[PDB]
């Protein structure tokens, strides 16, 4: 089917814009290596409050009460991170 | 097949989804292995 990510992005921008305690200035649209760093710079603040020994269990109690399974989503993300996709190295631009 | 490093945790996910706490059952089974329970019997079966 032909119903792409823009429908889900329109809901992602809502979940941000209904948590934004509106600033005086706009926010910065990070590139993917500040996204990777922001994830780990935050996880390294979470895991000083919550031990990883109980994390996925406590998350499954909280989110399983709303019908999410975490282990399935993890094993999907393991198979997605094992997937040998497209071969890189784009050719030369326009003219020389 | 299963490392003990994850056993009680995985069992608590599976059986906690059905309403069981393993930690209270273990702490009961610890007290049921520490408890100095009775030796010879008080008088049941009184027609003996």
């Amino acid at each position: 089917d032909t119903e792409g990510f823009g429908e889900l992005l329109q809901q992602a921008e809502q979940l941000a814009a209904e948590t934004e305690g509106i600033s005086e200035l706009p926010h910065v649209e990070r590139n993917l290596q500040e996204i990777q760093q922001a994830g780990e710079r935050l996880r390294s603040r979470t895991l000083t409050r919550t031990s990883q020994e109980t994390a996925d269990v406590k998350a499954s109690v909280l989110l399983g009460s709303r019908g999410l399974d975490i282990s399935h989503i993890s094993q999907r993300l393991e198979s997605l991170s094992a997937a040998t996709t497209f071969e890189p190295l784009e050719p030369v631009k326009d003219t020389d | 097949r299963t490392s003990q490093e994850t056993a009680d945790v995985k069992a608590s996910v599976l059986l906690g989804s059905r309403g069981l706490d393993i930690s209270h059952i273990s702490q009961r089974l610890e007290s049921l292995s520490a408890a100095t329970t009775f030796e010879p019997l008080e008088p049941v079966k009184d027609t003996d």
Binding site: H72, Q75 | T2, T6, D8, K10, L14
Partner: peptide, 18 residues
Amino acid sequence: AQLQSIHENVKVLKEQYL
């Protein structure tokens, strides 16, 4: 803990195939 290590794998096959 063994059955958890299988029952989840069954769901990975199920949401891949149906």
